[PDB]
């Protein structure tokens, strides 16, 4: 089409024509938009109806990783950006169906414990806080905290020997660098001084706070049984493994946790603590800790099937993220009651639940919409922080263009962020390169 344009005007209008943000669309490029760990999965069957012509185009978003490093010295901004992912990852993880009914389980838990109506004993409080609603809640805050890397915090009472035995299942499956250290040590010390050091007869440890070693790292050196020193070594050396899959760095679990073979290393350890005599303890202490170790040891078939279910719903939902997941201890820790862990291990049975594909394409479309909005508000602000230094505007102050960058990101609040965290955030936005569609329109 002909024109009449000024030679300055034609240089601008030619640049809008050559540099268009459209790319051709096919059938082989819709299926490549789905992540590779879902269209290679054998549980989901993928089907489509129409085939698009050679004309049709689409605009590709830019999913490149974090260039500001908000997990590095920005410790109050990272807490809002990782609480936001934790509420989103909690409304996606599925809820359990076809549980063992609560009435038929406490009737079986009351006959194994053999609780008497006249003597007051410590086998009454094994029955507290189990129901079908808190069993559904421990399953969510274990998967949703792992995908968002929120720090957890255990909460329990030390006069309950069932939240301590079923607390030996959290530490052997969930990695130990995830619970906060003031609450990881105070739970490992309650297992040591109650379950295992009275079981072999040695003197209980006098542990002062501030030691460099957790009480599971100092007890495997002191103990001399073999099959309880293999479990006590797996708990210490349990870590995530940082691998880069499909561009995004995500933290996979161990190869024994995915199989469920960890529980067969645990049910040889506490199958031996119920075989030892308790020499320095009275007879009513051997019996009230061997009954609570039996309610977990009759669920060996159901706990290998439970470890294989947390490790699978964490694998499928990890393919639906796009932002890089980093491992940094956050300020505010999201609580986890240790009584609801006990309510999960002895209420689940014989019903696999996997996340439906209509919520994998919705958990993916939110993680792309936030990531392609976060990466296109960087380039809108780097290209003005740099353009107000090339033009030599020495009287301008750059608070009003970082204040509109925190605001246009929808998840932040401005009445909380002070001025110190805004003139230092623009110390990072100055070193970044300008995106190549904004640089030639400034030159």
């Amino acid at each position: 089409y002909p024109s009449i344009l000024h030679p300055i005007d034609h240089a601008f209008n030619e640049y809008f024509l050559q540099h268009q943000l459209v790319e051709p669309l096919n059938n082989d490029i819709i299926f490549n938009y789905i992540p590779e760990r879902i269209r290679n999965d054998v549980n989901y069957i993928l089907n489509m109806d129409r085939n698009l012509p050679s004309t049709a185009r689409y605009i590709r978003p830019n999913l490149l990783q974090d260039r500001l490093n908000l997990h590095d010295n920005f410790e109050s901004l990272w807490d809002t950006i990782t609480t936001s992912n934790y509420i989103l990852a909690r409304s996606v993880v599925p809820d359990l169906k076809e549980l063992v009914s609560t009435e038929a389980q406490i009737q079986k838990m009351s006959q194994d414990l053999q609780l008497e109506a006249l003597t007051i004993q410590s086998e009454t409080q094994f029955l507290t806080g189990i129901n079908s609603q808190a069993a559904n809640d421990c399953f969510k805050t274990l998967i949703a905290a792992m995908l968002s890397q929120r720090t957890m915090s255990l909460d329990f009472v030390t006069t309950n020997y069932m939240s301590l035995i079923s607390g030996m299942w959290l530490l052997t499956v969930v990695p130990n660098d995830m619970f906060i250290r003031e609450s990881l040590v105070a739970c490992q010390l309650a297992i040591i001084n109650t379950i295992i050091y009275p079981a072999f007869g040695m003197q209980r440890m006098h542990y002062r706070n501030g030691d460099p070693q957790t009480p599971f790292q100092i007890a495997e050196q002191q103990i001399q049984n073999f099959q309880v020193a293999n479990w006590l070594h797996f708990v210490n050396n349990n870590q995530f493994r940082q691998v880069v899959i499909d561009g995004v760095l995500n933290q996979v679990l161990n190869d024994n946790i995915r199989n469920g073979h960890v529980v067969n290393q645990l049910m040889e350890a506490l199958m031996q603590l119920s075989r030892q005599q308790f020499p320095t303890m009275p007879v009513d202490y051997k019996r009230s800790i061997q009954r609570g170790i039996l309610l977990l040891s009759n669920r060996l078939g159901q706990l290998v099937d439970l470890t294989r279910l947390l490790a699978y719903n964490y694998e499928t939902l990890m393919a639906c993220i796009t932002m890089n997941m980093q491992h940094v201890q956050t300020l505010t820790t999201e609580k986890l009651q240790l009584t609801s862990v006990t309510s999960l291990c002895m209420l689940i049975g014989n019903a696999t639940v996997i996340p439906s594909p209509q919520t994998l394409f919705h958990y993916y479309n939110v993680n792309v919409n936030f990531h392609s909005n976060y990466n296109e508000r960087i380039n809108d602000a780097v290209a003005i922080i740099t353009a107000a230094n090339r033009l030599n505007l020495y009287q301008k102050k750059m608070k009003s263009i970082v204040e509109d960058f925190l605001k246009r990101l929808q998840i932040f609040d401005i009445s909380r962020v002070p001025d110190d965290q805004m003139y230092r955030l623009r110390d990072r936005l100055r070193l970044l390169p300008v995106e190549i569609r904004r640089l030639d329109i400034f030159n």
Binding site: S101, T102, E103, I106, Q107, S110, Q111, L115, E116, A117, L118, I120, T124, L127, T128, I130, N131, S132
Partner: protein
């Protein structure tokens, strides 16, 4: 109340009615020990 789960309290069985009575005469014994110390 007892603060056990609600499907055990409103249930009408024999193995679940005894469990409410045993947890009711453990409270009356735990309050009997705490009262004798206070005198």
């Amino acid at each position: 109340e007892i603060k056990i789960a609600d499907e055990v309290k409103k249930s009408n069985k024999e193995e679940s009615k005894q469990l409410l009575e045993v947890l009711k005469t453990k409270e009356e014994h735990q309050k009997e020990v705490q009262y004798e110390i206070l005198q």
